[PDB]
Design a protein around this ligand. Structure first.
Ligand SMILES: Nc1ncnc2c1ncn2[C@@H]1O[C@H](COP(=O)(O)OP(=O)(O)O)[C@@H](O)[C@H]1O
Ligand SMILES: Nc1ncnc2c1ncn2[C@@H]1O[C@H](COP(=O)(O)OP(=O)(O)O)[C@@H](O)[C@H]1O
Ligand SMILES: Nc1ncnc2c1ncn2[C@@H]1O[C@H](COP(=O)(O)OP(=O)(O)O)[C@@H](O)[C@H]1O
Ligand SMILES: [Mg+2]
Ligand SMILES: [Mg+2]
Ligand SMILES: [Mg+2]
Lengths: 165, 359, 359, 359
């Protein structure tokens, strides 16, 4: 509990990501498939990392699979908060749930790891409705599609982003 | 894009009209500390909170908790605004008329749904099988119903209710697994036993013959891996747990089995239509997904029915979600758009309009 | 400029918030003649006085002597005024609630600290590694703790305490160094053996294979020269001394090793969360600084855990002072200034305020 | 002279029919090196051995180790030949029929007893209190059972099992005595803590009120002398250790207390007999010997039961060995000699004779 609060920009972005409003397909393409959150310069608020986001419209035209490109956006030596809209298919349902991803690599500086870990339980309480959490502490624990599928529904998941495992 | 919600006694099925399978299937529980968790959130905390079933036996008993489940359904599970999509609700058989108006009032005043509709779960199961006349043995989580239907209308005087379903079988499997040395008592361990029941349990055609087979060899034993990596072995408990459906005395229950309940509800109908109900027995619900349950039901009802009657048990492969899939197809039809209860129509006639528009 | 004090079982770490390493690291001892000496002063007199540990096993037992250590810490070691700086204290797992209020009462009444805060040592170690869920096996001077943590909250029913740590290993090394003819019995000689242990001891992956290697050649011998001119040559004692951690029977102790203690504490948690604890085992404390201890724990726990579980032992390079460094980072944050227990709040709520603000 | 053997979960009671008290009372453990020690022999070696409970939870799980216990019972404890005396065995409630045939087979072939009999522990306790209808709260070493009995027949569908008994209370006392600075971790120190529990612990009528009383004075403190001559003082731990029976959350358990388990098992019976079970609640087992447990159970159940029902908790002074003394009186009757299962009858009907002669 480091007291780091969540900026209103992150809350607004999460609200659009969670609840889908009926909109024209042009606005549907502007929906965020994935987004990264980072500490501010003064380390007082959780803010949106500018330029680090994946749009639904980018999927299928410039982005072939949404997960591997999202992993590439993760810094190698820095901690980051992530929100991934996972579209997967189970043996008896096609599900679309948000995944809160805690990226804290071992190569990250000690100061970054301590602040992000201690403030994770505060930001996740503000983002109500998220039922999946992925804590990755190395590149191996986040780059694999089967790792995300195991967290989503375990062995019951048969597809992820429209591609079989 | 309409919404289809199947408010089951133990599991809530939700999705969009036109889809083949429900998007969200979560337990219908509300958890409060021993401040309020709904669905899988209430099961993630395990033992700190106490869980309550608002629709425990298909009939809603706590309307304050059901308003939380519907709110959790639209925003957290379906991730849509209920004010922008018409919602199709399903109701259990023998639902009191007071409850039907309550769902209409909640949908239009709290969630502000543009349109709304109520359908009977048993009728949707029968229609999904291509039938309008027959008897539906809808065995769910907390309640088992045998609903004889003639020309699309259920016969209320012949509908029988059995408080014996998958919830009681999961508790019985937990009890008989302790005879092998295992210990499943906690809420988390109850979900593991439920997964064992859904994967390894089956109905034996001849229970006494099957018991002798399991006591003379190990060909019926199966291995299951726990979430912590431990592997357990289950033997004769595979067919003993679902045997309580046909022998409720295994649970200390004084009622009859699902085969006699189906036969008794047939005998409560008109004698001229009993021949049609014998050959049109349709299984529905999750508790009817045990392999060999259709062959066992066929054998048991045959021993009860007259020898000249043709007994035919219908077990469609998609009978687990036949209520929801039937509703989704119906709600996606362009010709069904005139059957909705509009908000304008609700403002004039009030909640009582559901009786004349949805019967 | 806040103060961070880590009250360890045998070593007291203190410093200022924002610094990378503690400024003062001195033994937490009180010496009285066989009139009161604390820290290195009590060890400088050697054998004339008798030394007592007030916090011997992580839990403060003699509150009168623990006050002197705090007085020595603030005035003699940190050379700072207690009333001008908020102080962040650390507590061992399973610390009784009665002790927590006593630390708050002493800080506000004796030292008149403007602000106060208590943190769990195991949680700070886990947070410093970038984890909110995991098990921290904290091996210090007088006690070893395996503390499973889930979302930042330690599970008290699964916390296991082992009375086997570096203090016992130092005594064990002295006992086995006498088999080679060297003599170490005095208090001054004990500190020499401790320096030997911290520099030449290592954990062997295979103990029996390593023993054969040391008995067939001299490649494992590392000649250590004492402050005087004897120049001992420690051979197989390099890996025999830390082997007592995994084989406590070497010390005549019936308790299990650190690998079995970690596994037993995992098995006391929920079966759902055991998978996450296996892959998030974090080492902390000075006694975990032997080279090869992470690999040995990985091999030992794997033989205990199911083969389908992924065992991952995390040994950060800074794990010796991970408790203090984690506290220093937290106490130096501008947003953390709202979580201090102010003196105005202690005056209203009394010593019981710490239970709500520090959990 | 018949033999009466009470196979408890943690302690084995043996003796002769007609005696007032069992001759031999030894722990039911089997010790093997970390080659076979049973009873007090396995506890005399302390930590050099690993101890296993073959009947850990009232139900036999390791039949190979049980034969060692029975062999130790007859020859080393009773000092008699099994082939010269009939033996009366006691079984836990909900004992599978497969186990009952196994005990019959073992005593007739391995020990060659002339006669043999099986009795239910709960029914023997109820009979010893002069009742045929009632509910028995049998709390022993490793398991606690609530067995409702109507006209001498236990109701299997309403029997509830709680894995919380004296063994878990001894460990909890060990855990909370370390908060006072004491160290009880070894097997030898566990027997000392067990003696402290059996002599100084009591059940507080009002737990919260008693904690305030113990926090304001020293009238509730008691002194105990260790076998080595030392003296320790225990305070509020006297009533906190048995409080885990009514608040299992003290041990991290999600299960309900003994008062709620008794109430839940009553509510699982027929509505007409619940009135008789409320006024005929009989306590049995060693763990029910805490002073004040009958008054606490009376108050706790009363708050659960309707105010119009009469709650009467029966706590006979001999309830620690009510199962054995009930068996010894029954086995010593001349009219009971026709109820034995003879070897001649076993040679004809096989192990299945026990189902028709002992029910
Ligand atoms: N494959 C399966 N085999 C046996 N039982 C199942 C299977 N799948 C689900 N069930 C059982 O069905 C029950 C709920 O099914 P469902 O009919 O959807 O519930 P509801 O009562 O809400 O309609 C669960 O308790 C579960 O134990
Ligand atoms: N490099 C090292 N190798 C082995 N042991 C060490 C090393 N450094 C410190 N220790 C041991 O760690 C013990 C105390 O370390 P620490 O974790 O600070 O104790 P505490 O947590 O009780 O304050 C000392 O007794 C010392 O023997
Ligand atoms: N006077 C007493 N007060 C409290 N506990 C007791 C007393 N006597 C025995 N016990 C406890 O009862 C437990 C088991 O007794 P018993 O009923 O013989 O168990 P079992 O039925 O499993 O043989 C022991 O662990 C012991 O701690
Ligand atoms: Mg249903
Ligand atoms: Mg420490
Ligand atoms: Mg007993």
């Amino acid at each position: 509990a480091s007291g780091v609060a969540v900026s209103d920009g992150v809350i607004k972005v999460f609200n659009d990501m969670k609840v889908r409003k009926s909109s024209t397909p042009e606005e549907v393409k502007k929906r965020k498939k994935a987004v990264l959150f980072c500490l501010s310069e003064d380390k007082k608020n959780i803010i949106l990392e500018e330029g680090k986001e994946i749009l639904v419209g980018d999927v299928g035209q410039t982005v072939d699979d949404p997960y591997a490109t999202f992993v590439k956006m993760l810094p190698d030596k820095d901690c980051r908060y992530a929100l991934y809209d996972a579209t997967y298919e189970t043996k008896e349902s096609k599900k679309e749930d948000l995944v809160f991803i805690f990226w804290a690599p071992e190569s990250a500086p000690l100061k970054s790891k301590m602040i992000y870990a201690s403030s994770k339980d505060a930001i996740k309480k503000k983002l109500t409705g998220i039922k999946h959490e992925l804590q990755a502490n190395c590149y191996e624990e986040v780059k694999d599609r089967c790792t995300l599928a195991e967290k989503l529904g375990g062995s019951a998941v048969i597809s992820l982003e429209g591609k079989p495992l | 894009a309409a919404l289809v919600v199947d408010n089951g006694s133990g599991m809530c099925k939700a999705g969009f009209a036109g889809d083949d399978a429900p998007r969200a299937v979560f337990p219908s529980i509300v958890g409060r500390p021993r401040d309020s968790y709904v669905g899988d959130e209430a099961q993630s905390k395990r033992g700190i909170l106490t869980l309550k079933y608002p629709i425990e036996h298909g009939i809603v008993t706590n309307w304050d908790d059901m308003e939380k489940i519907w709110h959790h359904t639209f925003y957290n599970e379906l991730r849509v605004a209920p004010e922008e999509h018409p919602v199709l609700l399903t109701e259990a058989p023998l639902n009191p008329k007071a409850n039907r108006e309550k769902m209409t009032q909640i949908m239009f005043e709290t969630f502000n749904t543009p349109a709304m509709y109520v359908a009977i779960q048993a009728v949707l199961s029968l229609y999904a099988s291509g039938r309008t006349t027959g008897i539906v043995m809808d065995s769910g989580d907390g309640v088992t119903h045998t609903v004889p239907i003639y020309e699309g209308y259920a016969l209320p005087h012949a509908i029988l209710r059995l408080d014996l379903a998958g919830r009681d079988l999961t508790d019985y499997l937990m009890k008989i697994l302790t005879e092998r040395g295992y210990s499943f008592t906690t809420t988390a361990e109850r979900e593991i036993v439920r997964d064992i029941k859904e994967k390894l349990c089956y109905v034996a055609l001849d229970f006494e013959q099957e018991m002798a087979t399991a006591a003379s060899s190990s060909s019926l034993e199966k291995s299951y891996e726990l979430p912590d990596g431990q592997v357990i072995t289950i033997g004769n408990e595979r067919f003993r747990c679902p045997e309580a459906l046909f022998q409720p005395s295994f649970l200390g229950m004084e009622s009859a089995g699902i085969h006699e309940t189906t036969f008794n509800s047939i005998m409560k109908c008109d004698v001229d239509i009993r021949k049609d109900l014998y050959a049109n027995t349709v299984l529905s619900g999750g508790t009817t997904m045990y392999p060999g349950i259709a062959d066992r039901m066929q054998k048991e009802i045959t021993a009860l029915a007259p020898s000249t009657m043709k007994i035919k048990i219908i077990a469609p492969p998609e009978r687990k979600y036949s209520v929801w899939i039937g509703g989704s197809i119906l709600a996606s039809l362009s010709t069904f758009q005139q059957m909705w209860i509009s908000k304008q129509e609700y403002d004039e006639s009030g909640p009582s309009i559901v009786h004349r528009k949805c019967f």
